[PDB]
Amino acid sequence: VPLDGGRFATSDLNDLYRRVINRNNRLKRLLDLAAPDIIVRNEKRMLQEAVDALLDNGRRGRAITGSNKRPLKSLADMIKGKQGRFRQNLLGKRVDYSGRSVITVGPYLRLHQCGLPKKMALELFKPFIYGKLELRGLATTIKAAKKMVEREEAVVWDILDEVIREHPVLLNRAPTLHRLGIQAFEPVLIEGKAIQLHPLVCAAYNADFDGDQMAVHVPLTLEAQLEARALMMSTNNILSPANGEPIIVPS
C-alpha cells in the first residue's frame, strides 16, 4: 500500500516470496551453464532454506531478518499465536454500533434502565434516525436527513426519543469473568458524557465509580432485541448462576 509522503508499506510475505523466485530463477539459469556440481548443490540448499523460511520461519535454523533487526513473519506465523487469525480475528472481532465512556451513579434509576448520553445515542442510533426522518416526511432524501442530524435540529431529538423508546442496549465491562458482565438495559437519554449505572448492578460487574469505563452495544435485528429483552435483561438476572443466591444485594 502507498502511505502519505510517497512512502510504501509492505508485508513480509512479499519479501520472502521474492527470495524464492530469485533463487529459483538462478537455479534454472545455473543448470543451463552445466556449472560444477558444488555450485548447483549450494544453490539447491539455499533454495530449500528460502522455501522453508517462507512456510515456517525460525524453525529449521536461524530466522531471516528484514531491513530492521527482527525476524520476518511467514505463512505459519500468520495463523498461530494470540495475535493470529483464529484468536484475534475469528473469535474476537471489533464491532460497529458500539461506544464506550466513563460510568457514574444515577441512584434514581430503576433496575431495568440505564442513563445514556444524548451525544452517544445520536451516534449509535444514526441509521434508525435516518429511517424515521425520511419515513415521516421531515427529510426528502437520506442526504437531507444526514444534514438535519449534522446540524442537530429540534425534531432530531424528538425522533431520537422515539427511536430509543423500547430498544435495549448491552453494557459490558472489560474483564467479563462470568455472564453477568454483559447485561441489557433500557436507555434513558441524559446530558453530559458519562453513563449512569444502577447501584444494585455494580456488584455483578465488579464496578466502582473511581474511573471505570463501560462499552455499550446496540442490538439491531428483531431477534437480537428479543434476546436482549428476554435473556439478558437486568431484571431477569437477580440470582447467581454459580450458586442460587441473590446477586442484587444492597451493598
Partner: peptide, 10 residues
C-alpha cells in the same frame, strides 16, 4: 551444523 554457509565453507 545448520548454517548453509558453514557447509559451503567446509
Amino acid at each position: 551444523t545448520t548454517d548453509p554457509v558453514r557447509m559451503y565453507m567446509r
